[PDB]
Design a protein around this ligand. Structure first.
Ligand SMILES: *[C@@H]1O[C@H](CO)[C@@H](O[C@@H]2O[C@H](CO)[C@@H](O[C@@H]3O[C@H](CO[C@H]4O[C@H](CO)[C@@H](O)[C@H](O)[C@@H]4O[C@H]4O[C@H](CO)[C@@H](O)[C@H](O)[C@@H]4O)[C@@H](O)[C@H](O[C@H]4O[C@H](CO)[C@@H](O)[C@H](O)[C@@H]4O[C@H]4O[C@H](CO)[C@@H](O)[C@H](O)[C@@H]4O)[C@@H]3O)[C@H](O)[C@H]2NC(C)=O)[C@H](O)[C@H]1NC(C)=O
Ligand SMILES: *[C@@H]1O[C@H](CO)[C@@H](O[C@@H]2O[C@H](CO)[C@@H](O[C@@H]3O[C@H](CO[C@H]4O[C@H](CO)[C@@H](O)[C@H](O)[C@@H]4O[C@H]4O[C@H](CO)[C@@H](O)[C@H](O)[C@@H]4O)[C@@H](O)[C@H](O[C@H]4O[C@H](CO)[C@@H](O)[C@H](O)[C@@H]4O[C@H]4O[C@H](CO)[C@@H](O)[C@H](O)[C@@H]4O)[C@@H]3O)[C@H](O)[C@H]2NC(C)=O)[C@H](O)[C@H]1NC(C)=O
Ligand SMILES: *[C@@H]1O[C@H](CO)[C@@H](O[C@@H]2O[C@H](CO)[C@@H](O[C@@H]3O[C@H](CO[C@H]4O[C@H](CO)[C@@H](O)[C@H](O)[C@@H]4O)[C@@H](O)[C@H](O[C@H]4O[C@H](CO)[C@@H](O)[C@H](O)[C@@H]4O)[C@@H]3O)[C@H](O)[C@H]2NC(C)=O)[C@H](O)[C@H]1NC(C)=O
Ligand SMILES: *[C@@H]1O[C@H](CO)[C@@H](O[C@@H]2O[C@H](CO)[C@@H](O[C@@H]3O[C@H](CO[C@H]4O[C@H](CO)[C@@H](O)[C@H](O)[C@@H]4O)[C@@H](O)[C@H](O[C@H]4O[C@H](CO)[C@@H](O)[C@H](O)[C@@H]4O)[C@@H]3O)[C@H](O)[C@H]2NC(C)=O)[C@H](O)[C@H]1NC(C)=O
Ligand SMILES: *[C@@H]1O[C@H](CO)[C@@H](O[C@@H]2O[C@H](CO)[C@@H](O[C@@H]3O[C@H](CO)[C@@H](O)[C@H](O[C@H]4O[C@H](CO)[C@@H](O)[C@H](O)[C@@H]4O)[C@@H]3O)[C@H](O)[C@H]2NC(C)=O)[C@H](O)[C@H]1NC(C)=O
Ligand SMILES: *[C@@H]1O[C@H](CO)[C@@H](O[C@@H]2O[C@H](CO)[C@@H](O[C@@H]3O[C@H](CO)[C@@H](O)[C@H](O)[C@@H]3O)[C@H](O)[C@H]2NC(C)=O)[C@H](O)[C@H]1NC(C)=O
Ligand SMILES: Nc1nc(=O)c2nc(CNc3ccc(C(=O)N[C@@H](CCC(=O)O)C(=O)O)cc3)cnc2[nH]1
Ligand SMILES: *[C@@H]1O[C@H](CO)[C@@H](O[C@@H]2O[C@H](CO)[C@@H](O)[C@H](O)[C@H]2NC(C)=O)[C@H](O)[C@H]1NC(C)=O
Ligand SMILES: *[C@@H]1O[C@H](CO)[C@@H](O[C@@H]2O[C@H](CO)[C@@H](O)[C@H](O)[C@H]2NC(C)=O)[C@H](O)[C@H]1NC(C)=O
Ligand SMILES: *[C@@H]1O[C@H](CO)[C@@H](O[C@@H]2O[C@H](CO)[C@@H](O)[C@H](O)[C@H]2NC(C)=O)[C@H](O)[C@H]1NC(C)=O
Ligand SMILES: *[C@@H]1O[C@H](CO)[C@@H](O[C@@H]2O[C@H](CO)[C@@H](O)[C@H](O)[C@H]2NC(C)=O)[C@H](O)[C@H]1NC(C)=O
Ligand SMILES: CC(=O)N[C@H]1[C@H]([C@H](O)[C@H](O)CO)O[C@@](O)(C(=O)O)C[C@@H]1O
Ligand SMILES: *[C@@H]1O[C@H](CO)[C@@H](O)[C@H](O)[C@H]1NC(C)=O
Ligand SMILES: *[C@@H]1O[C@H](CO)[C@@H](O)[C@H](O)[C@H]1NC(C)=O
Ligand SMILES: *[C@@H]1O[C@H](CO)[C@@H](O)[C@H](O)[C@H]1NC(C)=O
Ligand SMILES: *[C@@H]1O[C@H](CO)[C@@H](O)[C@H](O)[C@H]1NC(C)=O
Ligand SMILES: *[C@@H]1O[C@H](CO)[C@@H](O)[C@H](O)[C@H]1NC(C)=O
Ligand SMILES: *[C@@H]1O[C@H](CO)[C@@H](O)[C@H](O)[C@H]1NC(C)=O
Lengths: 404, 97, 455, 137, 48, 49, 48
């Protein structure tokens, strides 16, 4: 910016390595020297994908008979299957579908180790009682979602023509659940744990007969003694049954085999892209790398082989082969710059020139912009390493000189 | 008698190995810290992006940034300490020669 | 529900002789972590040729566990009689995080026939039977070991060729020597080798059928079987429970000779298992053909950090329990089985509480009466009750109203009703429910801007 | 390489410029330290080392074999990872990591680079060899 | 509507749920021992 | 732990962790600076003796 | 001693291993410094 504010000169900081240098010092004039700059990135040349492909995950149970009350929720656990939430959601009039610790787009598109679906009858009038922040009876004694795993909650109404789902007489819930200790002075509220059933489930009937019913069980000594007690409550039934569906997903306890179905191209196979840098998504595991055919190590049944820094370093494919996985590797870059001549050369340290006058292979890497001179110096200003030096022609190209 | 002296009982020899080990330790900080999540759901930025929307995605990426910026500051601080020490030591070597 | 075959039609159970003295043996086989005993392999992945620490459910180094041994029943020559068992059905344990079992460790050694201490025989592997569930209590005569509601039963059958897992309600039968009948001692399973273990056709329901003599199986939700190839190889079995169900682990399908356990099944058991017991088993052998059966050992699991040595082939052959002792802590901190000589600081030996002391204000109830009398104020004229030096009970107040929406901020729900405070301030007012959202922190409407705002 | 991250990284200021400049200076410091140290070991005048140097005093241990015998032994007995200055990039792809926690191959993965020293081995050997020959005189 | 605001340390935290006390939770009876404590809302571990 | 549930409890514990990890890193950095200084000083003491 | 904290601490990597190793080395340094210093103050011959 000039004094009058106009821009008269600029550097595109991603144009080349010399430009990166000027930008890092925020100046158009930097001192002579050899500087490290951002590496020349390897970029993906394609992608490989492997997903479980097969059986649909089965939501049929859900659709047949009278759903349980909130404290007796039923659980469907899906593993090793193709899921489709639209397939289930489309059967209900959804009133409220929200997600936590997972985006909306993600719930319907990511692969999981497992998907757990908890379904139950639930009045919509008590919607708020399922909130994480709630201190009412549902969240304290009946049903609580995980705080650790990503979850979604769907509240939906059963359509008049979905005749396979029947209604209970009333909606019901536990409004009290507690233990009376052996002294019969102290009463301890028994709160429901996330993803678990309340201890009072065994004393509370599948339908509370009437609001205010009190239940009691004498506990054995192995259960700590005393009494387990509970109180039920009811909500009048609606014209259409309202149901809640909790969804909990886990991301890495097993192969993430619960995936949306995918139509596979045969150009996304690993064997067809060996040696290339590709993006990968293997049963929910993703990143970038290069696959190589190699000797199997690790336990085959476990599929993914990890190193001591927890990187994925190998994989057993469903095509029967074991592949080594290497990172797409970046190519080191150092800029050799001479301020007086306004010239430069690029050193790719540690890199053979097969990956890059043409390029010159030197003891410290591959260098472009230098010409081999078979000349010696003592007075080296731009040392390259080992006993090599860049020597400006003064302008011409820099010479590669040896230090005497 | 010294030809067979580069062993476990040679203090000067261990100092040579230790200088080598110190270089390795300096590099191990960078190699080992990228696997940490620093409270994030994943050490992978790609996993964060794939799973979360921007208002939460941001917070998770930011945890990884803070952890990595911290790691690099620690690394640099040590390279400066180690290079200062080596430079003083080099002047001692100069005097001994 | 699942059809699990017909009910037993017998009017009586076989009499069970419980003589614990005969089973009070000392044959210790504690977990040797350095030999990787009891280890469940990290589940979602493998490693090769590395040493790393890992957090997971492991048995403790040195844990002796609980030894159980099955025996031959009583006989007279060629006619087997009464069953002979240990007091196992009444010995109910807390499940906690699950357990691992060492099975057949003594196989091929010369052992004892438990029922006849002077009789020796080659030891053969036998599989453990388990009963697991959410609630326990007693039977009709007061003996313990009854499980209520759905109970998970892991019952090996077919003379050791299958594992049968089922989740069902066990209804005690009322016949002679049965749990709801007369002269009951303990239920037990059995098989009769003479008719059940023919060289060709093994009776795959022999143990199920004996189980059924003591209980009627009702509302079974599942019954699964797993096949076991016969051998005399030491194997490990394990059980854990998560939100996904009960996980059954075994070494025999992946690392038969090595011993690492891998998951082979998940059962749709979602209620929490709190209790378990060993179902005693007695073999109705003839007197002339009694065998020594190997003892099995049950070890409890807990969330421990182990140093795990993964071989090139990925199996764990060696490990360190990082909390066992100070030397183990050292190895774990360097993530190595070999550390240099020296003097090192390690975690301190913690003092642990030996009890607790509590002092609370005890006295007057905090008084919510004002709240209940007369016309409540409008939202901008809310009234405030400040409670100090009193015993509070929110249920006492909440129970008087039909609560439509109760939420908390910067305090948990459990905490609001259970913690002590310097003060509790209660602001009450008339408020239409139709304007519920106007009380939200994020609201920019008239209530939050001009009438009432929370801290 | 993730753009969202880079976008957030920018809000921390010129963080990476500081990292690079601090290390650049720290690295120049060794080239200057080495240059100064060797300038001082350097002899003005020296006698040639010939086999037999030392007379009755057995100095074969120190004579160049070129590094001396003790010098090669010193290096052979110290476990040092090979940084691959000429083609390490490729060694780590065609062979892969030598072992667990291979910090040389980690360079191309983690984003760090080990730079070569100011002088090659034969030059350093030349300095100490000329030094040996200067001692008596 | 009922708003509830709670404060945790301006005074002795004397607004507590009622508790039935055992006499083995007294301080005098456990002197010299490491115990957990909860004294008018103040808690931790220590030796009295 | 006594006051908050996991999604918020975590954030609060994490603040304490970050502060304590920072403190320990600062401590260690200084013990290394101070021990390096003392070691140089010890060699000065050696020369003076 | 709080398990929840320890669980979260683990996500920061082997933090404590680094603290312990750094101090262990720093502490060895003084034992070596002292040993070397006294080895040099030590006399070969001395009068009473
Ligand atoms: C996850 O789960 C969800 C839910 O299960 C899946 O989403 C469904 O996907 C299917 C496709 O696989 C999709 O079917 C499509 O429906 C449209 C809509 O047509 C309806 O209305 C027209 C009005 O004119 C009617 O004529 C027609 O018959 C349909 O009527 C329906 O409703 C009436 C009552 O009102 C009933 O009486 C009817 O029986 C019927 O139920 C169709 O137009 C569409 O047809 C095209 O594809 C089929 C493929 O078989 C092809 O045969 C047709 O000729 C036509 O294809 C031509 O046109 C397309 C462009 O549209 C072009 O690409 C082709 O090349 C051809 O030129 C088809 O039947 C269903 O609606 C989706 N449902 C929901 C809720 O989303 C989702 O796919 C799953 N995900 C995964 C990964 O599996
Ligand atoms: C915080 O504030 C809350 C709210 O104020 C406190 O919670 C209350 O705690 C009391 C106990 O202190 C609890 O009372 C118990 O109620 C049950 C329910 O019985 C009702 O239904 C049965 C149906 O068969 C009726 O028969 C019975 O009369 C009750 O009917 C009520 O409603 C009808 C209208 O429908 C009215 O007409 C009635 O008058 C009545 O209002 C009782 O079963 C229970 O009884 C047991 O305890 C009493 C103690 O005095 C004892 O005398 C009884 O014999 C019986 O004890 C035996 O059984 C227990 C096991 O249950 C065993 O442990 C004993 O050893 C004996 O073997 C008692 O009356 C009330 O319901 C709670 N309310 C709420 C909303 O939670 C809370 O305690 C406070 N916290 C603190 C720390 O103080
Ligand atoms: C988890 O497991 C537990 C333990 O098994 C179950 O609790 C048992 O529940 C059953 C019933 O659900 C109890 O059995 C009997 O229930 C009768 C209910 O009476 C009504 O229904 C009967 C049906 O025929 C009608 O005839 C009657 O008119 C009523 O309409 C009680 O009346 C019975 O009482 C008898 O025993 C008592 C004992 O004191 C005597 O005082 C009575 O006079 C009479 O003889 C009996 O209670 C059974 O007792 C409960 N067991 C225990 C240990 O408490 C849980 O239900 C199960 N949970 C779930 C969710 O499935
Ligand atoms: C009671 O007695 C029985 C036998 O009477 C013992 O069973 C033997 O146990 C050993 C050790 O577990 C088994 O030996 C292992 O055999 C494996 C495969 O053997 C099969 O395949 C090879 C292939 O050449 C055949 O030669 C062999 O005959 C079998 O067909 C090997 O793979 C194992 O080697 C692996 O582990 C060793 C351990 O050091 C490594 O060194 C190897 O490199 C390799 O990793 C091993 O050799 C033996 O086969 C079992 N017998 C039977 C019949 O199966 C019971 O263990 C014993 N019970 C008790 C409690 O002691
Ligand atoms: C030994 O143990 C096994 C358990 O592993 C047990 O297996 C059960 O056998 C019964 C049959 O004896 C199976 O029940 C059948 O399953 C088929 C499945 O298609 C049904 O079609 C059959 O229905 C017909 O018969 C019914 C009999 O009442 C009629 O009511 C019905 O209307 C039909 O006519 C029937 O349900 C059962 O599923 C398996 N169970 C398992 C878990 O595999 C076996 O019976 C035991 N054997 C003995 C001798 O006890
Ligand atoms: C000056 O000193 C050097 C050593 O510093 C002497 O050379 C050494 O001579 C011995 C002979 O006893 C060699 O031993 C041989 O070692 C090999 C090792 O495999 C063994 O196979 C032979 O059987 C024998 O034991 C020793 O290696 C050799 N060392 C070197 C570096 O050459 C040298 O002779 C001395 N010169 C004079 C004039 O004394
Ligand atoms: N029917 C039957 N089943 C058996 O399992 C059985 N086992 C034995 C032998 N059991 C054992 C078990 C361990 C040791 C043993 O050598 N223990 C060591 C101590 C191990 C330790 O505590 O670390 C010892 O020296 O006693 C001996 C015999 C004998 N008869 C049997 N009979
Ligand atoms: C498993 O890891 C060990 C390291 O613990 C490897 O052994 C090293 O192999 C290299 C090969 O050049 C030698 O230079 C090292 O000196 C060996 N170290 C030890 C401690 O022996 C072993 O080869 C690895 N096995 C496989 C199949 O990769
Ligand atoms: C079942 O038998 C076992 C074993 O004999 C009993 O457990 C023993 O109980 C005595 C009681 O003083 C203890 O001293 C022993 O140390 C216990 N043994 C073991 C191995 O722990 C058990 O209590 C009996 N259970 C029932 C219900 O009768
Ligand atoms: C176990 O299954 C039975 C049948 O599927 C359930 O239903 C009862 O069956 C008995 C059979 O004699 C009938 O007399 C009852 O009237 C039936 N009750 C109902 C409500 O239909 C039984 O409820 C199931 N038990 C459990 C605990 O699920
Ligand atoms: C577990 O083992 C049983 C018994 O070997 C298998 O059942 C046999 O399957 C064959 C298949 O041709 C039949 O011919 C036999 O008649 C079956 N036997 C019986 C007793 O039914 C069973 O399939 C095996 N299970 C698995 C999962 O492999
Ligand atoms: C548990 C028990 O009572 N065991 C007794 C057995 C059985 O009565 C017979 O084996 C019946 O088949 O008989 C003994 O004489 C024996 O064999 O040593 C004494 C032994 O104490
Ligand atoms: C149910 O199906 C009948 C069939 O004619 C249709 O007329 C009716 O509108 C459908 N109802 C709903 C709610 O879709
Ligand atoms: C690869 O995909 C093409 C797409 O049409 C198909 O024609 C070809 O047969 C496929 N090859 C194999 C091996 O399936
Ligand atoms: C991988 O290598 C093995 C042997 O080294 C070979 O037989 C197999 O076919 C190769 N697989 C591929 C995909 O090239
Ligand atoms: C430069 O050319 C000379 C030819 O004499 C050759 O010996 C030397 O190795 C070359 N240097 C490089 C880096 O190629
Ligand atoms: C447990 O025992 C008591 C007396 O011993 C008896 O009254 C009670 O009914 C028993 N419980 C069961 C479930 O039979
Ligand atoms: C301590 O508690 C017991 C419990 O029954 C009681 O009997 C005893 O009198 C109490 N002691 C005092 C000093 O109150």
């Amino acid at each position: 910016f000039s004094v009058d504010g106009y821009i008269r000169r600029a550097i595109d900081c991603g144009f080349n390595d010399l430009s990166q240098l000027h930008c890092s010092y925020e100046s158009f004039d930097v001192e002579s020297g050899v500087y490290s700059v951002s590496s020349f990135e390897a970029k993906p040349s394609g992608s490989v994908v492997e997903q479980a492909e097969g059986v649909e995950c089965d939501f049929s149970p859900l659709l047949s008979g009278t759903p349980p009350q909130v404290y007796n929720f039923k659980r469907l656990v899906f593993t090793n299957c193709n899921y489709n939430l639209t397939k289930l959601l489309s059967l209900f009039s959804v009133n409220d579908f929200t997600c936590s610790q997972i985006s909306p787009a993600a719930i319907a598109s990511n692969c999981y180790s497992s998907l757990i679906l908890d379904y139950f009858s639930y009045p919509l009038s008590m919607k708020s009682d399922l909130s994480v922040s709630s201190a009412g009876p549902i969240s304290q004694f009946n049903y609580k979602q995980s705080f650790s795993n990503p979850t979604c909650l769907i509240l939906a109404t059963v359509p008049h023509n979905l005749t396979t789902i029947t209604k209970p007489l009333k909606y019901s819930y536990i409004n009290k659940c507690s233990r009376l200790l052996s002294d019969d002075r102290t009463e301890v509220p028994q709160l429901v744990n996330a993803n678990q059933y309340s201890p009072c489930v065994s004393i509370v009937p599948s339908t509370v007969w009437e609001d205010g019913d009190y239940y009691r069980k004498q506990l054995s000594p192995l259960e700590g003694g005393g009494w387990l007690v509970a109180s039920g409550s009811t909500v009048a039934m609606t014209e259409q049954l309202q149901m809640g569906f909790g969804i909990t997903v886990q991301y890495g306890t097993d192969t993430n085999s619960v995936c949306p179905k995918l139509e596979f191209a045969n150009d996304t196979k690993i064997a067809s892209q060996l040696g290339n840098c590709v993006e990968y998504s293997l049963y929910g595991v993703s990143g970038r790398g290069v696959f190589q055919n190699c000797t199997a190590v690790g336990v085959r049944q476990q599929r993914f082989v990890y190193d001591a820094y927890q990187n994925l370093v190998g994989y057993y494919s469903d095509d029967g082969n074991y592949y080594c996985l290497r990172a797409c590797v970046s190519v080191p870059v150092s800029v050799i710059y001479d301020k007086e001549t306004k010239t430069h050369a690029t050193l790719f340290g540690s890199v053979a020139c097969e990956h890059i006058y043409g390029p010159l292979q030197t003891p410290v890497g591959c260098v472009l912009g230098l010409v081999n001179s078979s000349l010696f110096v003592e007075d080296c200003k731009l040392p390259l390493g080992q006993s090599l030096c860049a020597l400006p022609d003064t302008p011409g190209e820099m010479r590669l000189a040896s230090i005497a | 008698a010294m030809q067979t002296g580069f062993t476990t009982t040679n203090e000067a020899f261990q100092k040579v190995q230790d200088a080598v080990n110190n270089n390795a330790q300096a590099l191990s900080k960078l190699a080992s810290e990228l696997s940490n999540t620093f409270g994030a759901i994943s050490a992978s930025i790609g996993d964060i992006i794939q799973r979360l929307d921007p208002p939460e995605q941001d917070a998770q990426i930011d945890r990884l940034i803070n952890g990595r910026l911290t790691t690099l500051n620690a690394f640099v601080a040590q390279q400066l300490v180690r290079s200062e020490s080596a430079a003083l030591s080099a002047q001692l070597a100069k005097d001994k020669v | 529900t699942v059809d699990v075959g017909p009910d037993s039609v017998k009017s009586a159970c076989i009499e069970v002789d419980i003589q614990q003295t005969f089973f009070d043996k000392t044959w210790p086989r504690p977990i040797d972590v350095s030999k990787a005993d009891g280890i469940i392999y990290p589940q979602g992945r493998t490693y090769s040729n590395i040493t790393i620490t890992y957090q997971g459910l492991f048995p403790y180094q040195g844990d002796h566990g609980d030894m159980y041994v099955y025996s031959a029943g009583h006989a007279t020559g060629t006619t087997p009689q009464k069953l002979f068992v240990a007091n196992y059905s009444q010995d109910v344990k807390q499940f906690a995080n699950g357990f691992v079992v060492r099975i057949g460790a003594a196989a091929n050694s010369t052992g004892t026939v438990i029922i006849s201490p002077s009789t020796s025989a080659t030891i053969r592997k036998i599989y453990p039977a388990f009963m697991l569930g959410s609630s326990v209590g007693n039977f009709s005569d007061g003996k313990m070991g009854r499980f209520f509601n759905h109970t998970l039963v892991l019952l090996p059958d077919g003379c050791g060729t299958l594992l049968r897992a089922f989740y069902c309600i066990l209804e005690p039968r009322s016949g002679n020597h049965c749990p709801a009948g007369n002269s009951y001692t303990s239920f037990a399973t059995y098989h009769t080798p003479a008719t059940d273990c023919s060289d060709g056709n093994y009776n795959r329901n022999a143990s199920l059928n004996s189980f059924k003599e003591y209980f009627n199986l009702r509302n079974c939700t599942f019954m699964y079987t797993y096949n076991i190839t016969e051998d005399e190889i030491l194997e490990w079995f394990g059980i854990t429970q998560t939100a996904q169900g009960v996980h059954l682990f075994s070494s025999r399908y992946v690392d038969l000779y090595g011993g690492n356990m891998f998951q082979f099944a998940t059962l749709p058991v979602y209620d929490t298992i709190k209790y378990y017991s060993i179902i005693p088993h007695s073999i109705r052998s003839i007197q002339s053909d009694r065998k020594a059966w190997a003892a099995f050992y049950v070890y409890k699991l807990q969330p421990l950090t182990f140093l795990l040595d993964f071989s090139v082939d990925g199996y764990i052959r060696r490990a360190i329990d990082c909390g066992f002792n100070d030397l183990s802590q050292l190895h774990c901190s360097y993530e190595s089985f070999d550390v240099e000589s020296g003097v090192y600081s390690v975690s301190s030996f913690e003092a642990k509480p030996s009890g607790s002391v509590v002092e609370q204000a005890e006295g007057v109830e905090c008084d919510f009466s004002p709240l209940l009398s007369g016309t409540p104020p409008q939202v901008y004229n809310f009234k405030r009750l400040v409670f100090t030096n009193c015993n509070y009970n929110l249920t006492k107040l909440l129970s008087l109203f039909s609560v439509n929406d109760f939420t908390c901020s910067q305090i948990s729900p459990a905490a609001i009703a259970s913690n002590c405070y310097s003060s509790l301030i209660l602001d009450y007012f008339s408020y239409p429910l139709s304007m519920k959202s106007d009380l939200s922190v994020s609201s920019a409407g008239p209530i939050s801007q001009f009438n009432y705002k929370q801290s | 390489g993730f753009q969202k991250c880079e976008q957030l990284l920018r809000e921390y200021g010129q963080f990476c410029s500081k990292i690079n400049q601090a290390l650049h200076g720290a690295n120049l410091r060794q080239d200057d330290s080495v240059r100064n140290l060797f300038a001082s070991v350097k002899s003005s005048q020296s006698s040639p080392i010939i086999p037999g140097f030392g007379g009755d005093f057995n100095l074969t241990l120190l004579e160049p074999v070129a590094r001396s015998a003790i010098e090669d032994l010193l290096f052979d007995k110290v476990t040092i990872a090979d940084p691959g200055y000429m083609q390490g990039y490729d060694d780590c792809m065609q062979q892969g990591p030598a072992s667990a926690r291979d910090l040389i191959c980690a360079q191309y993965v983690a984003g760090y680079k080990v730079l070569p020293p100011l002088m090659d081995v034969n030059m350093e050997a030349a300095y100490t060899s000329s030094l040996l020959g200067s001692i008596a005189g």
